[PDB]
Subunit: 242 residues, 8 copies
């Protein structure tokens, strides 16, 4: 169907934890976002509980009207936490140095045994898994082989691009990777680092299922208010596919 | 008698620094705040430059339409910066939580003088303690900013009303000694009024609660609301 | 102190329960209200769980930024729930329509001590009746909430001025006994001012008229308008 | 032709009846909706008059600028009321939950002819069942409204895609028989698009989710957003 | 208590009748006004049914959340219509040439018998009567004598004033008349012709109970929307008494 | 293919004239409309000058940022004014309702020529009648504006779809004869789309419905909404 | 009494003339301002017509719903235009080196005869005259002797103050000058250079009748829109007197 | 592809300089515009610094979140400033009588050597250059020969058209010129003088890459506020390509 928007509210919690009070509350932000264009809410539960906390996840699981995408590292703690939470989606990301690739995505091709079992365990709990990876054919083929139904292409390099040519090259790499990914039966997401000024070229990629976006929305929100920030992003995304 | 609002935009920077991009930019937040009820903009240039950075301070000094309140610790590095930057105000802070002025009379006395010679109006961030207020007066600072943190963090209505009375008495005491008095740390939309109602209060410097409301409603409305509640309290 | 506004979000759940879905969610409404002028949120946990449910109270207790006022009947089940929940306030009501305190002195006395033991400030919902008020003071309650329903349902302006005067005298009487006094049931945008102008009023707990305005204009505006009218009446 | 939106304002009355006051008034909500994207207003006059009352229908019939869709059970009382009222549309529903037309051919046939005789366009509320659809065509109804409740309550995405496909095939079947087809029960802001994209859909009659959104954001915005999402799906 | 605002919605109907359709509907405007600062709604049922119609009055009587002020001429038709409608208030105004004074108000002093009976009949039906009159002591004393509980001072001349001095003179006349009126036990209203720029001096008059305003609000409304137009007027009125 | 909107502000004047003051002023409404989606402003200078007046026309000619469409009857007085005023457009109207051009070929032929010599683009307001359209073509007018009144006033969906088909055919017919075609009289927010969807339509001139929505929501939003619905229809 | 706000829309014409187009049009700005808190509209018809033009004045004179305050230099041309135009107010300002003071105000003391005839001529035309002067006793006595009913004190020096002390000094000077002028029978205005951050101290001065402000309001409008800019300035002024 | 909008904020500085104050500040305008649909911000650093100043450029270069388009005349001073500044784009325009065409565009044909070194020098600095020229084939061939990657066609004559025919003629001229330029390898922009009522026909031209508009947007902003003015212009442009 239409391109979906997942809104990552981690930075609502970073603002909160900066002072130790209860506000602003990620629970409030999730309602605002889900009623302004978000089709899902993403929260990354970190080992260091730097922003989102166990309390946020527990309450969010009961208050979200749409569905949760739990971003987490592939460790025994997170896996168990994920199985008991039962979020609709789970997005596996690199936590430490021996988890990420030279560009930032998960190293799936080099850890097939771990990834295969993670995917299987989460799947058994009824969670749809997405593997956050670089737009790299080796990782994509590996994602498919280990059984993950989704992959989320890391759009950071595209976003960080320091020149037009560098950006177009990265865009083309993402587009070609998404096409290759779909040919393997994978569903493909993206979103990390996307902004109001570079999101359309990514949203225009036909194979994209959902763009998971956080920072730029929250950064617009402090000026503009979360409702308009989410709605503007969703509007740009639909225009792009138009 | 005309209560002023100083908006601390440090947390705009915190949000930015969390990812290393240029947005959101403190410079934008300052224009919004100044046109929504802020009478001044406050930034705390920390040693680790974790949120506000030297770039921020340099650009804001050239873009603020009102005036800057530079929050900083008392060190030679910071004093030097202050002197060079020439902010309208400077709020000496540590780095109960207030600045120990009574325990470092020499250091604070020299700090105030130097900053004062740079044309900067100095305020010492202190606890609502009679000993510290006297020390502030004695050392020569024009302003003190009473730490409202304990008032904000109060757990019960009783502990709250007690910290309130302590601040009110501390303010009247400070004023009887020639000092101008500010407050603001930790104030929220739900506890700001009792503090705004204190006659001696000159300016309330508030940050976090405003930014927290802003991520939901936008900075302009967050600032106008806080300013409206403050004037209601004096009214 | 400023007149407070407690917003009763029960009818948000009424709207939700008419269909068995999870929306609209009282948890969202509480955030909106607390940021639009409410100083407290009221929920009435009815034995039949018509609207607010155990889930609601459980989550609200964790998400409210201000404080909870738990409206409830004086029964073992409810007293147990209240002790466990630890809301900041508890408003005891019947299962004119006010609580019969004067005729159940022992029961109310036990209830108040028990809730007070759990650190809960108790309010007895009663008619503007001096016998009931004296009894409320006698059984140890720190608060009473005067039933404004008769005033609100006044059929003629004569019955209205008459009910208003009754409430105002009752309030003055309650205060002279050391009680703090609330009100609010049935108040609307057109009749709230006369009640808000009564000096002894501490907090007005209003629900229905605000939610009825909200379905048209949105909750934020519905709450801010009620708070604005209340403060206008005081000044 | 453009996909139409009928807004069911029943829950405005639910909110009103929970207290016996005159607000919020369904008559106001109808004006708001009609000017924010609604092409029709739906009210369900239940025998128990739970929400919408005779007064409501009476006044609405005179104040609506668009047209009325009267939801009602197939009983003598209701048929009489409908004939007298002359709404532009009548939606027959049970007292999955769709009308059993295939098993009451004579009754539905009498109902349709009778309402058609009063100049009313009849819609039979039925399940996405080809047997029920064929029967609806056979008894003379010009419209059927497919029950989207099962689709809306889908527990898994599998059950959802399955219910969607069932509705879409049923719709195509209904159109091939000369019937016009509506839908809408249980649709929300997150699941309306897939139904609005079905080519044969004429009008979506939605209630609960819009009113649930309204108590938060106001009715005007709640309606305009639903209409916007519907038109986006079509293009 | 506080100064009240009655909003006259006649001109919503004049816009409607100009074309013969159902919109705009006075019923909608009454809801908007009552929720934006109006404490009452006024409608003038004219003999020629030029704007407000019998249908408007009939529906309004059932939809108003506050109270209706039925403006009408003193004729047998209107009196009977008023008795059966039972609006909370009734404001008697001049219809023809033998009904008004040289400035526009009702001629009460010169028609004591009619006015006395009108007042009595309406009062019997439980309607609070207001006599629309010029700021003229003779008419005011007569209003009191015929038993009317309210008078509405015609503020048209004040509004039409063509010079500052002319306005101040008219203001002072209104102020002195209101004071005289109250000394007779009368409650006093005003409002006709008031605008966003001259309403405050009138609202500042202590004896004023309610200002009934129509045209300027509707005229602002077509630009601005009725809600803001009503709220702005109510805001100015309360500032004046502040 | 790019549908234009002409906003008739006559009814702003009607409201003003009802009381003899200067407000509301058509001049203000024209700026609002032109910046909210109007591509042109229309005013009908009637003989009795009941709403728009000579002052209005004289000032608007100097303040409009887009262009004026002068609606007027075919008389020497009006032609003279038009010639002097030099409006960009002129819409000849009577004073089924359309202009009888076929019955006054001589008069209309001379009218168009004179106005055309003054540099004015002429449109003849006519019924969707083949005889009148041919006459319009024959007499030399560049534009015709099809009277949509009967379409608007239709009582049933059948009478409506019939008037619609008549207008659509009339438009294609007019275009096949070299004429540019407009419409607009009586269009509302609920029936405008079917007319906007007609390919041949150049500009829709609409007045009353817009002003009627405006008294509720404000002119800016009323105009932007109508323009949005029109572009949606072509889209 | 009621502190008034006059909004100077000159800079709207400034923006326009920068291109020779017809927009933005001062006539529109005037309607927006008058409905958002302006009690009067001010325009300075310069000899060189740098911004406001004769058409502007001619049309404005017909569309203003409140009243016009025509700022102009004292010359036979302008005097004739003023007498022709008949604006409610006329504020005489300096435009040439031999008309201005070393502070920026009109030099009335140095041109007693010229000002005397100006005030008399304009007064016979029914125009209320104000002399834009510095907060200087010599000029004030001069303004009083020549017969002008109003003076508008130049708040520019107060506005441009660089230190809190310099500012406190100028305010004091203005407050004493206002009292001094009132003791001579003059009514007093101010306004030039006032901003959203320094308007309150001036508005608080009791003798102030009207603050004529332009620049800061337009500067705010370019960002927030004219309506809110005017409404906000008006709100601040009433709060000060509150 | 995606039609871009560059907003020229020069007139914000225009308003400011009219008084020597610091407001309104172009730096604020740029943040508002970039978050409301502007894809770039344009500033014309004039030799005389009539509006935009060196500080403006210096600060803007550090606060812009999108990119700068520096309009400037061709002189050693400006070239050095540009090379120093390193804006993403540079649009060379005429400023003196011997630099302009009888239409208003830059005279590239008549100064091939100068333009040739400008383009080369600016290009080594990594700046993309655009030559602001008339819709004239001689200038276009010249722009192509000298090596500029972009040309910006002067839409002023189209904007100032007085008759629908005159306008139709200019549009045609621009559309053919755009196609002609693209056939020579140039990318093409336009924008000068475009308004909310004539922007669509230009936006519809396929070869258009970016429309740089300023004046009409600021003129609308003074009334409605900058955010809506920018958003609305962007909306109209996308509708045209729709």
């Amino acid at each position: 169907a239409e391109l979906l928007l997942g809104v990552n509210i981690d930075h609502i919690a970073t603002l909160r934890n900066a002072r130790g009070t209860a506000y602003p509350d990620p629970v409030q932000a999730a309602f605002i976002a889900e009623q302004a264009g978000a089709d899902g809410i993403t929260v990354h539960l970190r080992e260091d509980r730097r922003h989102i906390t166990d309390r946020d996840v527990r309450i969010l699981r009961q208050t979200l009207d749409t569905r949760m995408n739990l971003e987490m590292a592939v460790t025994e703690e997170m896996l168990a936490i994920a199985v008991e939470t039962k979020p609709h989606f789970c997005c596996l990301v690199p936590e430490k140095r021996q988890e990420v690739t030279t560009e930032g995505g998960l190293d799936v091709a080099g850890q097939r045994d771990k990834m295969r079992d993670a995917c299987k365990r989460l799947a058994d709990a009824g969670i749809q898994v997405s593997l956050f990876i670089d737009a790299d054919e080796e990782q994509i083929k590996a994602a498919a082989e280990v059984g993950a139904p989704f992959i989320e292409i890391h759009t950071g390099c595209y976003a960080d691009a320091k020149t037009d040519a560098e950006q177009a090259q990265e865009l083309a790499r993402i587009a070609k990777a998404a096409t290759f990914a779909a040919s393997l039966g994978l569903k493909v997401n993206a979103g990390h680092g996307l902004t109001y000024h570079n999101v359309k070229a990514i949203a225009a990629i036909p194979e994209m299922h959902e763009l998971n976006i956080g920072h730029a929305i929250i950064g617009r929100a402090v000026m503009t208010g979360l409702k308009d920030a989410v709605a503007e992003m969703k509007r740009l995304m639909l225009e792009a596919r138009g």
